[PDB]
Structure formats: C-alpha cells, structure tokens
Amino acid sequence: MKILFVASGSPATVFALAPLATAARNAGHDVFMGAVEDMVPYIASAGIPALSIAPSSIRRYATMDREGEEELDFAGHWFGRMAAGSMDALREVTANWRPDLVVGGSMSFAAALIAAELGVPYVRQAWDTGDAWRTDPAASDELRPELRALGLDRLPDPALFVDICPPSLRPATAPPAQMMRWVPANGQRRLEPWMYTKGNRPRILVTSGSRLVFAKKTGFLRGLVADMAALDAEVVIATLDEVAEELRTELPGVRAGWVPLDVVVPTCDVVVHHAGGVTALTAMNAGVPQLIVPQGGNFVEAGLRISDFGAAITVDENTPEAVEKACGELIGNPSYAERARELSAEIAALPLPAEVVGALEGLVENLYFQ
C-alpha cells in the first residue's frame, strides 16, 4: 500500500519516524516522507523518498502569528501554524500520489488534517517519551479554520496511537496505544575508530541536539565542557558540523561535530544534554546514565520521570558545581547505570517496528481498531 509519513522542522523528528517508515518499506509498501524543505536531505539520507511540504521560512511562525503551562500553549500554537503552512504542498502531492494511510509524529498535526481530507486512517507515532497529546488543545485552537472546513471542533483522535514510552515512564493518564520498541535511526557518517572504541578514562558525551537555533548557542556546550575539567574524563561534543568549527578553535583536544549518537553512546559513561527526548531515548536504549541540563522546551517534565526512576539526574540549576557533582555521581554510583539498563530491557520487550507494520496493514484492511 501507499503510506505517507509526515515529519516536522528538526532532524530528530525524521529520525524518530525512520524505523517505522523503513520497516514499512521492508514489508513491500510504497513509502514517502515529507518535512520542511531543509529537512529533506535528512529524509533522503535515511534512505526514504523525500518530499518538501513547507519552505524553511515557516520557522518565522515561532516568533509570529497568522496575522503577523506557557511552553505547552506556545508549542501547540507553533506546531499548529507549521501544520497550517504545510497543507498547500500536502494537498498538491496527495492529488498525484494518494496514500492509503498517513503516519505523523507527536506534533505533526498536518498528518491528522491531510488524512481526514483524504478519508484515510491517521496514525500518530510518539517521537519521544513525553506526553504526545499535552499540546493538542492549543494546536486545535490554532487550526480552528482547517478543522471547521472538515466539520471538526478539535483535532480528531488518531485511528491508532503508536507509543514508544516504556511502561515504567508511562503516565497513569496515557491514552491506549499500540506499543513499539524504539530504535535509533540518526544521521550517519563515515565511522572513525574513536567513535566505537573507548580509552582508559570515562567518556562524557555533551550535546544540545540537532536544531540549528539551539546548536548556535555554543556557550551552553562550552560551559558544560569546562564544568568537567576536575573529572579525569574524555569529553566529546556531539553538535552540528556548521557550528563545530567555532568550538574546535576555543576548545583544543575536544572533538566537536556530528557523531552518530547510536554508534558513540554505547562507549559513553554519561550523556549530558539540553532535555532532548530522542537523545534521552538513545541513552536509555544503550543503558547509559544521563545528565539533563534543562534549556526550556517541552521534554523537561518527561526528563524528570527518567530522573525519578533513577536512570538520570536533572540539575535544579545549570551551575558548574551542580553539573560536575551530578556527572561524578552518574559515573561513580552504579545504581544509575543499573536503572538505565532496566529501561533498556523495558524498551527491548516492546513490539518491533516490523510487527507494528502488521497493525498498520490490519488497520487499512479494516480488520483492527474498528
């Protein structure tokens, strides 16, 4: 069958959907994936046919409205405006290539709208362990004109929710879902021996994710690397190649640039990040403790669940003393790695993406979730 995947404005949203999209292609289905114009090379390099569904300028809707608790409301309205700006290209593509099913990420609201316009089932796939649905009332408010055309009062419930959240981190209030084993599918490069080999010292990976807006604030990574000086540890910076250069001149002896996280994370004692959900999943999957230094965003609450479970530490304040002490604890106290391995085991026990493709087939053949 024809399956349309709808990703968003950041590389992690492509990476989060690539296992289910490649699992569907491997089952013989015709799969296309769409995203913002500058995310198209990430889709193509994940080995998926790539569609541009919005110009890169649509990120202006993060600081502007359609006329020209707060974090939840803001994200719902931002992703809503991004969904609204993606409809023209999605309608043009689907008039020529009509999908039998549409799969969208957590906040890829245009997937919900195009599926309803086509009269085909809509599948929502969680792109992290955060509550995929917390931003829906704000998104429904933003998309009231598109929803009104379909005679809808709010975003419609998906025909199926595919969740990757392990049971120990899943809230009591979480909607029913087809569970799935999350697997990494991040951007790849030519591997160098340091990426898959470790030395005698513990290895600390520091990252601020794959969004250019976050990665450009190099002071965040520079400060975190400086905080680890007292530790006898090797520090590796995983960041965009476009911003790495500036970091290389400022920090001699520290590797900085794109390193496939799935390759290097199993060599790390600690993963230090900005509260990025897909980086959090990569660490949990490899049984690696993590240090979360929240820089706002909508994953902070879900990151606190990982900390409460004991597979991480969320620092109360970004101070050098708090960062170095937490890193020492994550390396030194074996309970953190023990809890991370328990989360890895929970993820491993969930249905494989190949098995979830069977649920999608059954859904389209009107056998399942009827």
Task: Match 């520090």 to its residue by tokens.
Answer: 235
Q: What whole-number distance in Å separates Cα of residue 281 and Cα of residue 27? A: 25
When the beta carbons of 74 and 258 are compared against a second copy, the nearer one is 258
Of ligand 3R2, a second copy, none, which one sits near residue 196, judging by CB under 5 to 8 A according to partner kind?
Answer: a second copy
CB of 80 to ligand 3R2, least distance (A): 16
Residue nearer to ligand 3R2 on the CB measure, 114 or 244: 244
When CB distances are held under 5 to 8 angstroms depending on the partner's kind, the choice from a second copy, ligand 3R2, none that residue 214 binds is ligand 3R2
Q: State in angstroms the smallest separation of the CB of 89 from a second copy.
A: 11
112: partner contacted, choices a second copy, ligand 3R2, none (Cβ within 5-8 A by kind): none
Q: Give how far the C-alpha of residue 200 lies from the chain's centroid of Cα atoms, to the nearest Å.
A: 32
Residues making contact with ligand 3R2 (CB under 6 A):
10-13, 15-16, 127-128, 186-187, 207, 209-211, 214, 238-240, 258-261, 273, 276-279, 282, 297, 299
Alpha carbon 29 to its chain's center: 24
Q: State the CB neighbour count (10 A cutoff) for residue 114.
A: 27
Nearer to ligand 3R2, 140 or 282 (CB): 282
181 contact, one of ligand 3R2, a second copy, none, CB 5-8 Å limit per kind: a second copy
The structure tokens listed for 350 are 């969930």
- Residue 48 interface partner, choices ligand 3R2, a second copy, none, CB cut-off 5-8 Å depending on type: a second copy
Query: Residues marked as binding for dTDP?
Result: 210, 258-259, 261, 274, 278-279
Annotated binding site for Mg(2+): 141
Contact present, 307 and 343 (Cβ < 8 Å): no
Q: Which residues are annotated as a binding site?
A: 141, 210, 258-259, 261, 274, 278-279
Nearer to ligand 3R2, 102 or 126 (CB): 126
Sign of the CA dihedral running 295, 301, 304, 309: negative
272 binds, among a second copy, ligand 3R2, none (CB under 5 to 8 A by kind): none
Do the bridges between strand 178-179 and strand 255-257 make them parallel or antiparallel, or are there none, so unpaired? Answer: unpaired
How far apart are CB 186 and ligand 3R2 at their closest, in Å? Answer: 3
Give the pair of three-digit tokens for residue 148.
């009104």
Task: Report the C-alpha gap between 287 and 212 in whole angstroms.
Answer: 28
Give the span between the Cα atoms of 14 and 42, in whole angstroms.
7
| Residue nearer to a second copy on the CB measure, 223 or 362 | 362
Nearest approach, Cβ of residue 73 and a second copy (Å): 34
Q: Which residues contribute to the site for a second copy (CB under 8 A)?
A: 18-19, 22-23, 25-28, 30, 32, 40-41, 43-52, 92-93, 96-97, 181, 183, 185, 188-191, 193, 196-197, 260, 262-263, 266, 348, 352-354, 357
SS3 67: coil
CB contact at 8 A, 213 and 239: no
Identify which of residues 266 and 310 has a Cβ nearer to a second copy in the complex.
Answer: 266
CB 221 within 8 A of CB 247: yes
Partner touching 24 among ligand 3R2, a second copy, none, CB below 5 to 8 Å by kind: none
In the DSSP assignment, the letter for residue 127 is S
Structure tokens at 277: 């959900």
Pair 336, 289: CB distance under 8 Å: yes
| Closer residue to a second copy in complex, CB, 46/147 | 46
| CB atoms closer than 10 angstroms to residue 77 | 20
Cβ atoms of 80 and 144 within 8 Å: the answer is no
Q: Which is nearer to ligand 3R2, 22 or 239 (CB)?
A: 239
Burial class for 13, CB neighbours closer than 10 Å (0-12, 13-18, 19+): buried
Provide the minimum distance between the beta carbon of 85 and a second copy in the complex, in angstroms, as a whole number: 18
For the CB of residue 137, give the shortest distance to a second copy in the complex, in Å.
34
